[PDB]
Amino acid sequence: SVLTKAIVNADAEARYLSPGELDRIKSFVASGERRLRIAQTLTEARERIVKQAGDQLFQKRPDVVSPGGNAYGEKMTALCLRDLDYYLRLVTYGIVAGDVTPIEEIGIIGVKEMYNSLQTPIPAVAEGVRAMKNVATSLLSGDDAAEAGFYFDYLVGAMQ
Amino acid sequence: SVLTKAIVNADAEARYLSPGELDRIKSFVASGERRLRIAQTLTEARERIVKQAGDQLFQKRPDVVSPGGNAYGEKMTALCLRDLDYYLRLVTYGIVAGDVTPIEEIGIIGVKEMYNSLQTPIPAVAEGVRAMKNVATSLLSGDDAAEAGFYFDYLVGAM
């Protein structure tokens, strides 16, 4: 969260919170109501976002949904969708927090290592998140979409 | 090499070479002529090893050499073969050294980064090395083959 990050830096410096840090907290609390609305929109449309994103991903990459591919088979395909749903949930948590800290601890640290054991291709996963962003952006208002885009972009960047 | 490794451990402990360290040098230098022979065989059959392993690889992974696939196109296919040749040369260096130091510096440290940028799939480069092992091992005597095998396996491990 924004709050957590500010406090943590101050504690390390052993100082009370700076005027600038206080201002950033004020801005975040003002933005909060908007943020909650954006999160709610995505939560409602989640089933649709996952499905549309999945389709795009499978179209872009035949291989994942092929005998060689990891996603091949119904169970495997479901798991690939489940993963996409997990990442969407993370993004919503990020938007309300105002930071990627929630996202990062749950999903980005160790992601390479986890996927490498599974043998899932990381670039494909990134594509799925990109896909999800495109769908999500359409549902959101332009201003809202920009905010949401940053969080989506972070995920895509991290999964690389 | 074996030499370098032994000396480095001694220098760090600020001591002369142990009897054990000396023994390992003795064993290694006795094996030298045999090691050179193994390397020579593989060097001579290089073109065959690469090519036959390449063919098996393309059979094992049709996708890479497909219009969708990364390796698709003749230029791209050549590069994949060139890479296999590079890795084979590295293996021979390892065998004569009796250790991986040469191999490791030239071909494994930073390897994850380079292929990932290129987008070439590493979960398949390892397979190509496995393929090369099978071909190379068939041109060697059983004892020689085992020695050569270790170095091939190391590469597969390192990726």
Binding site: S66, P67, G68, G69 | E47, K51, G54, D55, F58, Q59, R61, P62, D63, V65, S66, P67, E74, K75, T77, A78, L79, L81, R82, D85
Partner: peptide, 26 residues
Amino acid sequence: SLGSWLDAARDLISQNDYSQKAIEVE
């Protein structure tokens, strides 16, 4: 130049077509 690779690679592509095999789990 990788000339030897360039001719050998096209020779390999001409002798066999990879675009049908499909991956096998094995």
